[PDB]
Amino acid sequence: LQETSLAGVANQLLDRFIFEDQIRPQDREELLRALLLKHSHAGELEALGGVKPAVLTRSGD
Amino acid sequence: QMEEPAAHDTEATATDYHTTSHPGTHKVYVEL
Amino acid sequence: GELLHSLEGFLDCSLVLPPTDAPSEQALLSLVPVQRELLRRRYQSSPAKPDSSFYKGLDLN
Amino acid sequence: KWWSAVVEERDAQSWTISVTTPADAVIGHYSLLLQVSGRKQLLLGQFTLLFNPWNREDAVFLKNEAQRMEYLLNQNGLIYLGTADCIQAESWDFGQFEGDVIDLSLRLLSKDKQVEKWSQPVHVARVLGALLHFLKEQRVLPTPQTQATQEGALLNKRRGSVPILRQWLTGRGRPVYDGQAWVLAAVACTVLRCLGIPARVVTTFASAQGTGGRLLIDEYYNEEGLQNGEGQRGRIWIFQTSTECWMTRPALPQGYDGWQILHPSAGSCDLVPVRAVKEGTLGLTPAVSDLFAAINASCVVWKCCEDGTLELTDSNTKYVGNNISTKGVGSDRCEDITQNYKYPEGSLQEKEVLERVEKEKMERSPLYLLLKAPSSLPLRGDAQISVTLVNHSEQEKAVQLAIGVQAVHYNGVLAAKLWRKKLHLTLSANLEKIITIGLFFSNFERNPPENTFLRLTAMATHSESNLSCFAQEDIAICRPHLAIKMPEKAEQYQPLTASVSLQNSLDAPMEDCVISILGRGLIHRERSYRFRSVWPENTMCAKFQFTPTHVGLQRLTVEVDCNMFQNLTNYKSVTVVAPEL
């Protein structure tokens, strides 16, 4: 794949998923939005006060 | 009606996308 | 297909240790010869492709 | 002006050097090494050196800026095919900026052994042309004799110019058959653009190849109006492609800088200035005469008979080497550059040139007809043609009129016999007579091959005398139009929609309709989709959605295949801009 940014890679991967019926057409937006969030590291953890796992939702909450 | 088509997998012209450059050997650093 | 075949080869050369009541050190150290044999079976082939870089005639043999 | 190195910025721990390269250096893979007073050589890295049109002191230097972008930095080109009356554009992907193209080109060039001369583009271009012609002669297979319509979609589809180069150098891909042997110009242009020499592919319609240096072409026709036997030494091709290189000639007299036509000979190749071909200076390069003969020559037709004696006939003059066209700069419209090769017809300069060339080379009908035919024939359709006869005599006369329609390849190679018709006419008292007849696909003996053009011949034989009148025309087959709808501008990383429309103008429904879309910078690789049968009444319409990722001027190409026809392609361009900050 000829890309140099995460946005292009994500767009191409979502297009390929839609092509092969891996996901539904209306799930593209939420997955694309979730895949483009900020990527933290170990240093900021103390500034966040701890983390817990979460799960996506259609409504965005 | 202006309708969407269905997928159709075929390797008719796949061979036209195989590179000839040797990739080489590199170490990896994996992050999860 | 090549990635699937490589994954199958990866799964062929893995061994499972069931729950045994033996002491931990002895049970874990008993795996060295079997694992050595399995890895020797893993690295024996290492075939990828012949030297097909170019089919040149060069007009001068 | 020579190799040098100057320290631009100095720090406590780091140094910034600015290395310079002379304006005439050997191209290829380099290696940089460092020497300190005590220790041995140390390798720093590797780099590659290439020609550049941006330097005023270089042999290959283009003054204009748009020309630089069009002839060196572009990867999506157009090749013009078809007859001289209707020209069909085909979208080609040169792909000179791929990962492995430069390495393959340098490895192929490494079979020259005259390393010292790799600093001048003329030698490199000549060597590469000769090697590519040899590879084409070695690796191009003859077309299969068997008939296979089911697999016909896989023998004639082209995905660009890099797969062909890879298959020629390594022999690990789909081969190219004799039906498409004009791709050599595209491959050579791709390689030349990769090395940094501006190039362009031009197409000449009705070019008289074959004979070397002569100005006469002999054609033999049967009694019924067809061509008995197969083949000939020198025949008139439907079209021929040729690459051109922009550069300067230092070893030649002053006044020949510019475009050079790369002409390989069946090996050693060479390149010739255009102005030499225009003026007619045959003593400047061995290949000037061969190319001069191919642009302005005259043909004569011999009429065979059952007895076997060949008889000359009065034939209507046909034009040779006309309407030379290429891709326009900065747009997608064709431009004709036939004025750079020939003087205007019916002028003093052209006749002076012809008489001078003839002099230099010398050292070593009571009735007539004319034919009106359409410039194209709809697939599985019909069209009307007209033949008119005018006689000049005091007494009446009876004539034998024969009309033949037969297929031919792009290089004059016979394909099949399709239609023949003979009839009797009687003309009296100097009266003109017109005969209009129809031409249908339902009357053909068989189905014409995939990539062929029809030839229409008309012969009128006088009953009393032996001299007969002859005429011929070339017709191309046109296929249904494929419409693409899309906004002209799009934003990066946002969805984009394309609409595809097609109409069934044929007489039978289509089945197994498969359409593929691709494009560099818009989609990763090609994608294929299926459809339902389309009836002759209704139309087909489809929608696709994707997302651009790279900025600039891109385009997408779609392709349609079915049982009635194969490889129906179209293209559409778009401009995509960066997102707002």
Swiss-Prot record, chain B:
<comment type="subunit">
    <text>(Microbial infection) Interacts (via N-terminus) with P.falciparum (isolate K1) aldolase FBPA; the interaction inhibits FBPA catalytic activity.</text>
</comment>
<comment type="function">
    <text>(Microbial infection) Acts as a receptor for P.falciparum (isolate 3D7) MSP9 and thus, facilitates merozoite invasion of erythrocytes. Acts as a receptor for P.falciparum (isolate 3D7) MSP1 and thus, facilitates merozoite invasion of erythrocytes.</text>
</comment>
<comment type="subunit">
    <text>A dimer in solution, but in its membrane environment, it exists primarily as a mixture of dimers and tetramers and spans the membrane asymmetrically. Component of the ankyrin-1 complex in the erythrocyte, composed of ANK1, RHCE, RHAG, SLC4A1, EPB42, GYPA, GYPB and AQP1. Interacts with STOM; this interaction positively regulates SLC4A1 activity. Interacts with GYPA; a GYPA monomer is bound at each end of the SLC4A1 dimer forming a heterotetramer. Three SLC4A1 dimers (Band 3-I, Band 3-II and Band 3-III) participates in the ankyrin-1 complex.</text>
</comment>
<comment type="similarity">
    <text>Belongs to the anion exchanger (TC 2.A.31) family.</text>
</comment>
<comment type="function">
    <text>Functions both as a transporter that mediates electroneutral anion exchange across the cell membrane and as a structural protein. Component of the ankyrin-1 complex of the erythrocyte membrane; required for normal flexibility and stability of the erythrocyte membrane and for normal erythrocyte shape via the interactions of its cytoplasmic domain with cytoskeletal proteins, glycolytic enzymes, and hemoglobin. Functions as a transporter that mediates the 1:1 exchange of inorganic anions across the erythrocyte membrane.</text>
</comment>
<feature type="modified residue" description="Phosphotyrosine">
    <location>
        <position position="17"/>
    </location>
</feature>
<protein>
    <recommendedName>
        <fullName>Band 3 anion transport protein</fullName>
    </recommendedName>
</protein>
From Swiss-Prot, chain D:
<keyword id="KW-0265">Erythrocyte maturation</keyword>
<comment type="function">
    <text>Component of the ankyrin-1 complex, a multiprotein complex involved in the stability and shape of the erythrocyte membrane.</text>
</comment>
<comment type="subunit">
    <text>Component of the ankyrin-1 complex in the erythrocyte, composed of ANK1, RHCE, RHAG, SLC4A1, EPB42, GYPA, GYPB and AQP1. Interacts with SLC4A1 (via the cytoplasmic domain); this interaction is mediated by the SLC4A1 Band 3-I dimer. Interacts with ANK1 (via ANK 1-13 repeats). Interacts with AQP1 (via the C-terminal).</text>
</comment>
<dbReference type="InterPro" id="IPR036985">
    <property type="entry name" value="Transglutaminase-like_sf"/>
</dbReference>
<dbReference type="GO" id="GO:0170014">
    <property type="term" value="C:ankyrin-1 complex"/>
</dbReference>
<dbReference type="Pfam" id="PF00868">
    <property type="entry name" value="Transglut_N"/>
</dbReference>
<dbReference type="GO" id="GO:0005856">
    <property type="term" value="C:cytoskeleton"/>
</dbReference>
<dbReference type="Pfam" id="PF01841">
    <property type="entry name" value="Transglut_core"/>
</dbReference>
<keyword id="KW-0133">Cell shape</keyword>
<feature type="modified residue" description="Phosphoserine; by PKA">
    <location>
        <position position="161"/>
    </location>
</feature>
<dbReference type="InterPro" id="IPR013808">
    <property type="entry name" value="Transglutaminase_AS"/>
</dbReference>
<keyword id="KW-0206">Cytoskeleton</keyword>
<dbReference type="InterPro" id="IPR008958">
    <property type="entry name" value="Transglutaminase_C"/>
</dbReference>
<dbReference type="GO" id="GO:0005886">
    <property type="term" value="C:plasma membrane"/>
</dbReference>
<dbReference type="GO" id="GO:0005524">
    <property type="term" value="F:ATP binding"/>
</dbReference>
<keyword id="KW-0225">Disease variant</keyword>
<keyword id="KW-0449">Lipoprotein</keyword>
<dbReference type="GO" id="GO:0020027">
    <property type="term" value="P:hemoglobin metabolic process"/>
</dbReference>
<dbReference type="InterPro" id="IPR050779">
    <property type="entry name" value="Transglutaminase"/>
</dbReference>
<dbReference type="Pfam" id="PF00927">
    <property type="entry name" value="Transglut_C"/>
</dbReference>
<dbReference type="GO" id="GO:0000902">
    <property type="term" value="P:cell morphogenesis"/>
</dbReference>
<dbReference type="GO" id="GO:0008360">
    <property type="term" value="P:regulation of cell shape"/>
</dbReference>
